[PDB]
Every structure is written in structure tokens, then in C-alpha cells.
Coordinates of C-alpha atoms in Angstrom, one line a residue:
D1 CA 0.0 0.0 0.0
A2 CA 0.9 3.6 -0.4
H3 CA 0.7 6.8 -2.3
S4 CA 2.7 8.2 -5.1
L5 CA 3.8 11.8 -5.6
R6 CA 1.4 13.1 -8.3
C7 CA 2.1 16.4 -10.1
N8 CA -0.4 18.0 -12.4
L9 CA 0.5 20.5 -15.1
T10 CA -2.1 22.5 -16.9
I11 CA -1.0 24.4 -20.0
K12 CA -3.6 26.6 -21.6
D13 CA -3.6 29.7 -23.7
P14 CA -3.5 33.0 -21.9
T15 CA -6.7 35.1 -22.0
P16 CA -7.1 38.3 -19.9
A17 CA -10.2 36.3 -18.8
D18 CA -7.9 33.6 -17.3
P19 CA -4.2 34.8 -17.9
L20 CA -2.4 31.9 -16.2
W21 CA -0.9 30.1 -19.1
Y22 CA 0.5 27.3 -16.9
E23 CA -0.2 25.9 -13.4
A24 CA 1.2 22.9 -11.5
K25 CA 0.3 21.1 -8.3
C26 CA 2.1 18.2 -6.7
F27 CA 0.4 16.3 -3.8
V28 CA 1.0 13.1 -2.0
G29 CA -2.5 12.0 -1.2
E30 CA -3.9 15.2 0.2
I31 CA -0.6 16.9 1.3
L32 CA 0.2 19.8 -1.1
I33 CA 3.8 20.4 -1.8
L34 CA 4.3 22.6 -4.8
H35 CA 2.0 25.1 -6.5
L36 CA 3.5 27.1 -9.3
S37 CA 2.1 29.3 -12.1
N38 CA 3.2 32.5 -14.0
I39 CA 1.3 34.9 -11.7
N40 CA 2.8 36.4 -8.5
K41 CA 4.2 36.2 -4.9
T42 CA 3.1 36.3 -1.2
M43 CA 3.3 33.0 0.8
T44 CA 0.4 31.8 3.0
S45 CA 0.2 29.1 5.8
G46 CA -2.7 27.3 7.5
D47 CA -0.6 24.8 9.4
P48 CA 1.7 23.0 6.8
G49 CA 4.1 24.8 4.4
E50 CA 7.2 22.9 5.6
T51 CA 7.5 19.3 6.6
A52 CA 11.2 19.8 5.8
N53 CA 11.4 16.9 3.3
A54 CA 8.7 18.8 1.3
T55 CA 10.8 21.9 1.1
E56 CA 13.5 19.6 -0.2
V57 CA 11.3 18.1 -2.9
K58 CA 9.8 21.5 -3.5
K59 CA 13.3 22.9 -4.3
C60 CA 14.3 20.0 -6.5
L61 CA 11.2 20.1 -8.7
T62 CA 10.6 23.8 -9.1
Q63 CA 12.9 24.6 -12.0
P64 CA 12.8 21.3 -13.9
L65 CA 9.0 21.6 -13.8
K66 CA 9.0 25.2 -14.8
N67 CA 11.2 24.4 -17.8
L68 CA 8.8 21.6 -18.7
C69 CA 5.8 23.8 -18.8
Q70 CA 7.8 26.2 -20.9
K71 CA 8.7 23.3 -23.3
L72 CA 5.1 22.1 -23.5
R73 CA 3.7 25.6 -24.1
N74 CA 5.6 25.6 -27.4
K75 CA 5.1 21.9 -28.0
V76 CA 1.3 22.5 -27.9
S77 CA 1.1 25.8 -29.9
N78 CA 3.2 24.2 -32.6
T79 CA 0.8 21.2 -32.8
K80 CA -2.0 20.8 -35.3
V81 CA -5.3 19.2 -34.2
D82 CA -8.9 18.9 -35.6
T83 CA -10.3 22.0 -33.9
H84 CA -10.7 25.5 -35.3
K85 CA -8.2 28.1 -34.0
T86 CA -9.2 31.6 -32.8
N87 CA -5.7 32.8 -31.7
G88 CA -4.1 29.6 -30.5
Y89 CA -6.5 27.2 -28.6
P90 CA -5.0 24.0 -27.3
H91 CA -5.5 22.8 -23.7
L92 CA -3.0 20.4 -22.2
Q93 CA -3.2 18.3 -19.1
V94 CA -0.2 16.4 -17.8
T95 CA 0.1 14.1 -14.9
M96 CA 3.2 12.5 -13.6
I97 CA 2.8 9.7 -11.1
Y98 CA 5.8 8.8 -9.0
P99 CA 5.4 5.8 -6.7
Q100 CA 7.8 5.0 -3.9
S101 CA 10.9 3.3 -5.2
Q102 CA 12.3 0.7 -2.9
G103 CA 11.7 -0.8 -6.2
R104 CA 14.6 -0.8 -8.6
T105 CA 15.6 2.2 -10.6
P106 CA 13.1 5.1 -10.0
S107 CA 10.3 5.3 -12.6
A108 CA 7.2 7.4 -13.2
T109 CA 4.5 7.6 -15.8
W110 CA 3.7 10.8 -17.6
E111 CA 0.1 11.0 -18.8
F112 CA -0.9 13.5 -21.5
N113 CA -4.4 14.7 -22.2
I114 CA -4.8 17.2 -25.0
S115 CA -8.1 19.0 -25.3
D116 CA -9.8 16.0 -23.7
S117 CA -9.5 14.4 -27.1
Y118 CA -6.0 13.0 -27.4
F119 CA -4.4 10.7 -24.9
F120 CA -1.0 9.0 -24.7
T121 CA 1.6 8.1 -22.1
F122 CA 5.3 7.8 -21.4
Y123 CA 6.8 5.2 -19.1
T124 CA 10.1 6.1 -17.6
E125 CA 10.6 2.6 -16.4
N126 CA 11.3 1.0 -19.9
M127 CA 11.4 4.3 -21.8
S128 CA 8.2 3.6 -23.7
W129 CA 5.1 5.2 -25.1
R130 CA 1.4 4.1 -25.3
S131 CA -1.4 5.9 -27.1
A132 CA -5.2 5.6 -26.8
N133 CA -5.6 5.2 -30.5
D134 CA -3.9 6.1 -33.8
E135 CA -5.4 9.6 -33.8
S136 CA -3.5 10.3 -30.6
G137 CA -0.5 8.3 -31.5
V138 CA 0.0 10.8 -34.3
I139 CA 0.8 13.7 -32.0
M140 CA 2.7 11.3 -29.7
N141 CA 5.1 10.3 -32.5
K142 CA 5.9 14.0 -33.2
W143 CA 6.5 14.6 -29.5
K144 CA 8.4 11.5 -28.7
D145 CA 10.6 12.5 -31.6
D146 CA 11.7 15.6 -29.7
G147 CA 14.9 14.7 -27.9
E148 CA 15.1 17.6 -25.5
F149 CA 11.4 17.2 -24.5
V150 CA 11.8 13.5 -23.8
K151 CA 15.1 14.1 -21.9
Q152 CA 13.4 16.7 -19.7
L153 CA 10.8 14.0 -18.7
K154 CA 13.4 11.4 -17.7
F155 CA 15.8 13.9 -16.1
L156 CA 13.0 15.4 -14.0
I157 CA 12.6 12.0 -12.5
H158 CA 16.3 10.9 -12.3
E159 CA 17.0 14.1 -10.5
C160 CA 14.4 14.5 -7.8
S161 CA 14.2 10.8 -7.4
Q162 CA 15.7 10.4 -3.9
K163 CA 14.1 13.5 -2.4
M164 CA 10.7 12.3 -3.5
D165 CA 11.4 8.8 -2.1
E166 CA 12.4 10.3 1.3
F167 CA 9.4 12.5 1.4
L168 CA 7.2 9.5 0.6
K169 CA 8.7 7.5 3.4
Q170 CA 8.1 10.1 6.0
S171 CA 4.7 10.9 4.5
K172 CA 1.4 9.5 5.7
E173 CA 3.2 8.7 9.0
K174 CA 2.7 10.6 12.3

């Protein structure tokens, strides 16, 4: 039994109606860790905010994640779909699921959801891709063919591997 550290990236198009062009949240069960976006600063607490190992994982993930959203914001605008554009238009949904590795070499699964229409996944374990159908596998093959973008996916994991494992051990344990 357990939990995995789950991060959720949301890349949309700006819109002075909803400017935020990217947002990410990583939780382990219910415990929030990270919450980024392109908006602004403050820093609020209600009781949590620290749990020391979270500030550790928080520090590790922040940039690699930020660069990923940056990557994906272009990866998506560059992409052709079936929908009619107005001034851009895509809506991406990414979800990395990192389970506790006691298990051999740290692995995660990155899930992509484009416009709620296209779905495909990346498995860090055996460096593989799966698509929901051939309509989705089309985009997938364009993306998987992007070396830097794939690297970012594996490296994000290789990098914050240990710190996420440590946070997972201490987590859900008081």
C-alpha cells in the first residue's frame, strides 16, 4: 500500500479572462507540496508549508518543472489538431505519477491529455510510449521524436528521485 507523488501540469492559452498560461500542483495523497504558475508572490500558511522533506522536494522540482511547462507551451502551440483556431487554442493536461521506489531504478509515468480528445503516455521505467488510438499516436510520435522534451521527462525523475522517495517514506506517517 501507499501513495505516489502526483504532479499536475495545466497548460492553456493566456486570455485576460484567465491569464495563467500554466499551473502545476504536486500532492502526495492530500498533502500539497508545490503550486506554481506564472502569476505572482506572497506566501500563506494554514498549518503546513514545511515538513522539511517537502521543502526539499519543492526545491528540487521547481525549475525542472517550470522548464517543462515552458517546453510544453511551445510543443502544444506548434501542434495541429482537428479543432478551429481563434488565436491559438489547445489545452493540455499532464500528470506524472511517482510511486515509492524501494523498487529498482526510479520510474514514473507521464500522462498527456490534449483538449480531452487525445491521450498518450510515457513510461520512464522502460522508456516507452502508449497511445489511446492512432489519432493520438500521431501527436505522440511527433513529440516522442523531440529529444530535449523526452530528456526533460526522464531527467526530472532521475534528478528529484531520492528526495521524492524520502518525502514519501516520512509521509502519511505521524
